[PDB]
Amino acid sequence: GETPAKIGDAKLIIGPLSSAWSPFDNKVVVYGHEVYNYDFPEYGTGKAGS
Amino acid sequence: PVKAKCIATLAPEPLVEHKHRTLILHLHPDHPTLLTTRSLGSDANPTRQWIERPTTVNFTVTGEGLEYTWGNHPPKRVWAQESGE
């Protein structure tokens, strides 16, 4: 809520929005286009098969 | 018909995981595998289940021992005494 964007002629300031729901979780896996908000175990640890 | 020893089957090894008198076993076969056990008490309490879908299973092992048969892979055996300190 202090960024303008003088594109056109008008100067416009937006937000910050109140609805801070990031639909992404903290931990996310990503695949090509299908995005999975998955609790991936970690680098360095993942159990075999898992 | 003769008693040939076919070149024959084998299922991928299990993932042994410890718990207190309990075997968690994350398991992941190639094909449907008949697993089964024998709680070696005079209470047998055996189990049988064909496993084709990978499955984390559980086995309440007793004090004296249990055995474990991942397919025609040879039978395993396990001391589960305490682990609760």
Closest among B71, B68, B70, B69 to B79, alpha carbons compared: B68
A29: left (phi over 0), alpha (psi -120 to 50) or beta: beta
**Both tokens assigned to B50:** 């064909």
Chain B residues at the A interface, defined by Cβ less than 8 Å, are 15, 26, 28, 54
**SS3 state at B22:** strand
Chain A residues at the B interface, defined by Cβ less than 8 Å, are 47-50
Closest among B13, B15, B28, B18 to B70, alpha carbons compared: B13
DSSP label of B38 = -
Q: Does the distance separating the beta carbons of B28 and A47 come in below 8 Å? A: no
Chain B partners within 8 Å of A48 (Cβ) = 15
**Is residue B47 within 8 Å of B58, Cβ to Cβ?**
no
CA distance B33 to chain A (A): 17
**Environment class of B26 (CB within 10 Å of its CB; exposed 0-12, middle 13-18, buried 19+):** middle
In sequence order, the 6+-apart residues with CB closer than 8 A to the CB of A27 are: A37, A38, A39, A40
Strand partners, B56: B26
**Both tokens assigned to A27:** 């931990």
Chain A partners within 8 Å of B28 (Cβ) = 49
Starting at the edge strand found earlier in the chain, the sheet holding B22-27 runs B15-19, B22-27, B55-60
